[PDB]
Amino acid sequence: EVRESDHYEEEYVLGFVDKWDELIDWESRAESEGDTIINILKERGVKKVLDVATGTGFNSVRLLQAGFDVVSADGSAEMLVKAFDNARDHGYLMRTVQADWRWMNKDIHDKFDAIVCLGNSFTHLFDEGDRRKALAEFYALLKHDGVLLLDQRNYDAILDDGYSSKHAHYYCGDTVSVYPEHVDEGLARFKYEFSDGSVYNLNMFPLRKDYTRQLLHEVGFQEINTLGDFKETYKEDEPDFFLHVAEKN
Numbered sequence: 387e388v389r390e391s392d393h394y395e396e397e398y399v400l401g402f403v404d405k406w407d408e409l410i411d412w413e414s415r416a417e418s419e420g421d422t423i424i425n426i427l428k429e430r431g432v433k434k435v436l437d438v439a440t441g442t443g444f445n446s447v448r449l450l451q452a453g454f455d456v457v458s459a460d461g462s463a464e465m466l467v468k469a470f471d472n473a474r475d476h477g478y479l480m481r482t483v484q485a486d487w488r489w490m491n492k493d494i495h496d497k498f499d500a501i502v503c504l505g506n507s508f509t510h511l512f513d514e515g516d517r518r519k520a521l522a523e524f525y526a527l528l529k530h531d532g533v534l535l536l537d538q539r540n541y542d543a544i545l546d547d548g549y550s551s552k553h554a555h556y557y558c559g560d561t562v563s564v565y566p567e568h569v570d571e572g573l574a575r576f577k578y579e580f581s582d583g584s585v586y587n588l589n590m591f592p593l594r595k596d597y598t599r600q601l602l603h604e605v606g607f608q609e610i611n612t613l614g615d616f617k618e619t620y621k622e623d624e625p626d627f628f629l630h631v632a633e634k635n
């Protein structure tokens with residue numbers, strides 16, 4: 387029945403991350419990414435980190451290499467297998483937990499100095515109730531002085547700049563291009579095209595910057611610093627990403 391379709395959408399994204407990891411090696415990605423995330427955590431004396439969007443494990447492995455104690459959670463068991471084996475290949479024992487954002491402490495019973503939700507993951511929630519619930523679950527998993535690091539694409543530029551926003555964005559040189567095929571206030575569909583000709587189309591929710599900030603404030607975070615993050619190969623006046631640094635207190 388509809389199990390075939392749900393299996394297809396999971397397999398589609400799994401193929402997407404496999405293609406990304408096939409053509410974009412992690413060392414190139416680590417050097418392109420700053421050490422900004424790591425230093426932010428270090429400056430706050432973070433030891434214990436929960437990654438709630440492990441995916442194939444890049445953020446988790448980077449934090450393990452940096453010396454953090456990391457728990458690697460993801461809603462997808464198949465992602466966590468890839469993440470664990472990638473960490474293994476880099477010489478690290480990952481601690482994987484399958485967990486849905488709407489009930490994060492079902493199987494995670496510890497509290498954390500920081501949570502990372504990176505790679506533009508939070509945009510995958512299309513329901514506002516789910517968005518609030520997810521952020522409340524993260525908030526409850528933080529120690530009193532903990533911090534949430536949560537990023538997203540800059541959807542404001544696409545929703546507002548109009549004709550000047552209808553162009554592709556490139557990552558890791560020219561290895562992948564990302565083109566906004568369709569954007570309205572409720573839905574953004576991007577075309578991802580890789581250097582080998584592979585094409586994937588992915589849906590996400592186009593969170594406005596101040597909306598995300600409003601959600602974070604509303605579930606109880608007391609201080610939110612939003613940083614512009616220029617990750618694309620051909621920089622523009624507007625950053626293509628934002629990084630929210632939300633302090634529980």
Ligand SMILES: C[S@@+](CC[C@H](N)C(=O)[O-])C[C@H]1O[C@@H](n2cnc3c(N)ncnc32)[C@H](O)[C@@H]1O
Nearest residue numbers: 439440441444460461462465486487504505507
């Ligand atoms: C874009 S990937 C991020 C990968 C990694 N952070 C990186 O940048 O390399 C987003 C991940 O979040 C997970 N995810 C999406 N919705 C979720 C939910 N409701 N609960 C738990 N995980 C979810 C997906 O399984 C996927 O692995």
